Amino acid sequence: MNLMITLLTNFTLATLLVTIAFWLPQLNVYLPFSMKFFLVAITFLLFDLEIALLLPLPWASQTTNLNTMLTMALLLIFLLAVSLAYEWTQKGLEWTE
Amino acid sequence: VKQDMPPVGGYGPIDYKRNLPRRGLSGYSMFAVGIGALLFGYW
Amino acid sequence: MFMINVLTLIIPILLAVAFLTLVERKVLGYMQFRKGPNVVGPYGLLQPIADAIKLFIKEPLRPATSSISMFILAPILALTLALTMWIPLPMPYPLINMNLGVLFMLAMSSLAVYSILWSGWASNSKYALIGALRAVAQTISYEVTLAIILLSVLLMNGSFTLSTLIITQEQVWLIFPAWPLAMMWFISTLAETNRAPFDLTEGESFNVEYAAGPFALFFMAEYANIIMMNIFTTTLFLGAFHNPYMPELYTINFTIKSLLLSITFLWIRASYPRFRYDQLMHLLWKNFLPLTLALCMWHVSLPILLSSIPPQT
Ligand SMILES: CCCCCCCCCCCCCCCCCC(=O)OC[C@H](COP(=O)([O-])OCC[N+](C)(C)C)OC(=O)CCCCCCCCCCCCCCCCC
Ligand SMILES: CCCCCCCCCCCCCCCCCC(=O)OC[C@H](COP(=O)(O)OCCN)OC(=O)CCCCCCCCCCCCCCCCC
Ligand SMILES: CCCCCCCCCCC1=C(C)C(=O)C(OC)=C(OC)C1=O
């Protein structure tokens, strides 16, 4: 509730400052497609999904199945690294390396 | 006469070569300090 | 009474952003063997006020924009997200004490690329859109190491709670067990805010169609982001002493550390040339990301092998 008030206050202040900046000086009279950018955006998306898999780790370390948890955590970070290594060696990270 | 001239003994030696003083620790010392900071933090 | 607390957060944000411009011009003056602004105010203190009054009455640039709606929404979104990044910050107490404040900040900072994307598309210039796409690709690249470094650090915290991160650093700064994460974090926050040596929006090798007013709004959102990421880096790695009966000790201490870290941003822009675009892509994808994955494995496995798993609550 306090958060909704704070978001509404920040949005209201930002909209008020933008409305000032677009209407205070009104008082005075006075591309070809690049495959490389798409590939870096998709590589971001895929690694961002891998990060979404990695995000419950500070809670996952609290388990009583720690051998399994440590195995799966290292396996997810390893598969993120194998994704990066495949992206590296097949020239996917080139001219924007 | 009134002529701009260098002095009798001449001017001093002007330094012109590159002087990079080579400061800092060794590579092994910097990795030892960094790993020691890691071990202190871990302990 | 809560609205007073919201205003005493967000209006001093705007004042500190206003005087960060003075601090930047003075520090970049005295590091370049000259003086900064010292003519307008006493010790130059009225230069941001005069510059704000100059920008508010400057002529509108009058763009024939592709969309009026996203042209308005990009400064609104940039300023709103710049102000909402401050509300979970524990200094020592946050405005909004939320359990997942770290993840909240990561999500609200991931949303800030839409201001770049919408301002680049809302401009007619194809080259403004090309620069916007380069800036978005840079920002989403360094968000990856932001997320993974922050996850690796919070493996020592126990939770996503920003206020717990003060408890985590009562015996030692967290820069001592995590200085490689700290330095890749600091360079990644430097590349997040489009800040030198990562400012390719100022190099000749996206918001040029805005008037002086909305350019000032994007600029003050950017400096709010700079001060905020330095405060968040301070809370994250250089956590101060907190006495619960004297909270101002924590506030003075984190404020001094955050000011020194913002001045370190100013030192860095006055010391190095820019990266070429492929070079900072190389810096992310081929240097910071392999080390960040290796250190994420190490900071998963290290609390288990040392029996130093932090508490959940
Ligand atoms: C948070 C508080 C502040 C933190 C510190 C920040 C302050 C200092 C800032 C200095 C100015 C920086 C301005 C921007 C600079 C950007 C460029 C840059 O830094 O590039 C990074 C450079 C990039 O390299 P490069 O591009 O310069 O070099 C060439 C690279 N190749 C070969 C690929 C062409 O280095 C890194 O990426 C390193 C990151 C940190 C690594 C930390 C390693 C810790 C030790 C691990 C163990 C080592 C021992 C061996 C194993 C032992 C096992 C027990
Ligand atoms: C183009 C459109 C306009 C664009 C500019 C303006 C919008 C962008 C900037 C604002 C973004 C709004 C984000 C709102 C949700 C943020 C997530 C969130 O609420 O996290 C905080 C917290 C979670 O922490 P926790 O401690 O677990 O919760 C309390 C439990 N003890 O959770 C809580 O504290 C929960 C509190 C109650 C629920 C709050 C719900 C807020 C309203 C819904 C979202 C409104 C905005 C929707 C559109 C945004 C743009 C996509
Ligand atoms: C009403 C509250 C303040 C609104 C924002 C205006 C003042 C802050 C930005 C102005 C500014 C300053 C001082 C400034 O120094 C500067 O040069 C580096 C700018 O241009 C890039 C600026 O836009």
What's phi and psi for C194, nearest 5 deg?
A: 55, 50
Q: For ligand 2, say whether the CB of C100 is within 6 Å of any of its atoms.
A: yes
Query: Which string of b and e fits B26-39 if b means at least 16 CB within 10 Å?
Result: eeeeeeeeeeeebe
Q: Which amino acid is it at C116?
A: I
What would you report as the CA-atom Rg of chain C, rounded to the nearest whole angstrom?
Answer: 20
Question: Which residue, C74, C72, C100, is CA-closest to C87?
Answer: C100
CA–chain centroid gap for C164, Å, is 21
Tell me whether the omega of the peptide bond preceding residue C60 falls within 30 degrees of 0, making it cis. no
Any idea what the Cα angle at residue C256 is, between residues C251 and C262, rounded to 5°?
120
Q: Do C302 and B42 touch (CB under 8 A)?
A: yes
Domain residue limits at A31: 1-97
* Resolution to one decimal, Å: 2.5
Find all residues with CB under 8 Å of C22, minimum gap 6, and list them.
Answer: C36, C37, C44, C45, C47, C48
Q: Which of C129, C130, C312 sits opposite A59 (nearest CB)?
A: C312
Question: How far is residue A36's CA from residue A3's CA, in Å, rounded to a whole number?
Answer: 40
Q: Tell me how far CA of residue C16 lies from CA of A50, C33, C180, C224, C244, in angstroms.
A: 37, 25, 30, 8, 26
Nearest by CB to C306, from B34, B40, B42: name it: B42
User: How many beta-carbon contacts under 8 Å exist across B and C?
Assistant: 19
- Contact partners, residue A63, CB within 8 Å, separation at least 6: A69
**In sequence order, which residues have a C-beta less than 8 Å from that of residue C56 and are 6 or more positions away?**
A20, A21, A24, A25, C212, C213, C216
**Cβ–Cβ gap C137/A41 under 8 Å:** yes
C-beta atoms of A18 and C72 within 8 A: yes
**CA–CA separation, C206 and C228 (whole Å):** 22
- Residue A31 near residue C64, CB atoms below 8 Å: no
Looking at the DSSP bridge assignments, the partners of residue C246 are C243
- Tokens representing C93? 């107490």
Query: How far is the C-alpha of C74 from the C-alpha of A9, rounded, in Å?
Result: 17
Domain extent at residue C248:
1-313
Please provide the distance, in angstroms rounded to a whole number, between the alpha carbons at the two ends of chain A.
Answer: 45
Give the helix/strand (H/E) hosting A47: helix A35-54
Mutate to test the interface with C, among A7, A9, A48, A75 (most CBs of C within 10 A): A9
Whose tokens are 């250190």? That residue is: C295
Q: Is there an atom of ligand 2 within 6 Å of C73 CB?
A: yes
Distance CA C14, CA C10 (A): 7
Cβ of C267: how many Cβ atoms within 10 Å?
14
Q: How was this structure determined?
A: cryo-EM
Start-to-end C-alpha separation, chain B: 80
A47 within 8 A of C144, measured Cβ to Cβ: yes
Q: Does ligand 2 have an atom closer than 6 angstroms to the CB of C99?
A: yes
| Pairwise CA distance, residues C260 & C230, whole Å | 9
| C 280-309 residues with CB < 8 A to B | 302, 306, 308
Alpha carbons C193 and C225: distance in angstroms, whole number:
7
Instruction: Classify burial at C3, counting beta carbons within 10 Å of its beta carbon; exposed 0-12, middle 13-18, buried 19 or more.
Output: exposed
**Cβ atoms A87, C141 nearer than 8 A:** no
Structure-block tokens of residue B30: 């910097």
Residue C243, strand partner residues: C246
Task: State which residue of chain B sits closest to C177, comparing Cα positions.
Answer: B41
DSSP code string of chain C? -HHHHHHHHHHHHHHHHHHHHHHHHHHHHHTTTS--S-SSSGGGTTHHHHHHHHHHSSPP-----S-HHHHHHHHHHHHHHHHHTSTT--SSS-SS--TTHHHHHHHHHHTTHHHHHHHHHHSS-HHHHHHHHHHHHHHHHHHHHHHHHHHHHHTTTSSS-TTHHHHHTSSS-TTTT-HHHHHHHHHHHHHHTT-TTS-TTS-----TTS-HHHHHHHHHHHHHHHHHHHHHHHHHHSPPP-BTTBHHHHHHHHHHHHHHHHHHHHHHHTT-PPPPHHHHHHIIIIIIHHHHHHHHHHHHHHHHHTT-PPP--
Number of domains in chain A: 1
Report the pocket of ligand 3 as residue ranges, CB < 6 Å: C 14, 18, 21, 25, 48, 51-52, 55, 216, 219-220
Q: Which two tokens stand for residue C310?
A: 């932090």
- Output DSSP code: residue A62: T
Q: Kindly state the helix (H) or strand (E) to which residue A49 belongs, with its residue range.
A: helix A35-54
A59 to chain C nearest CA, in Å? 7
Residue of C nearest to B42 (CA): C177
Interface of A with C in 10-39 (CB under 8 A): 10-11, 13-15, 17-18, 20-22, 24-26, 28, 30-31, 37
Q: Which chain B residue is nearest to residue C303, measuring alpha carbons?
A: B42
Q: State the residue for tokens 């900046």.
A: A21
Q: Which residue has the tokens 């990044």?
A: C85
For ligand 2, the distance from its centroid to the CA atom of residue C169, given in whole angstroms, is 29
Do B41 and C308 make contact, defined as CB atoms within 8 angstroms?
Answer: no
Which run of H or E residues covers position A53?
Answer: helix A35-54
What is the Cα–Cα distance from C25 to C40, expressed in whole angstroms? 13
Q: How many Å lie between the centroid of ligand 2 and the Cα of residue C104?
A: 9
Pocket test for ligand 3, best of C10, C17, C21 (most atoms within 8 A of CB): C21
> Which residues are CB-contacts of C147 (< 8 A; sequence separation ≥ 6)?
A48, A51, A55, C106
Alpha carbons C179 and B42: distance in angstroms, whole number: 12
Among C53, C297, C299, pick the best mutation site for testing chain A contact (most A Cβ within 10 A).
Answer: C297
Integer distance in angstroms from the first to the last C-alpha of chain C? 29
Give the total number of structural domains in chain C. 1
Q: What b-and-e string marks burial along A11-37, b requiring 16 or more CB atoms within 10 Å of the CB? A: bebbbebbeebbeebeeeeeeeeeebe
* C-beta separation of C156 from C310 below 8 A: yes
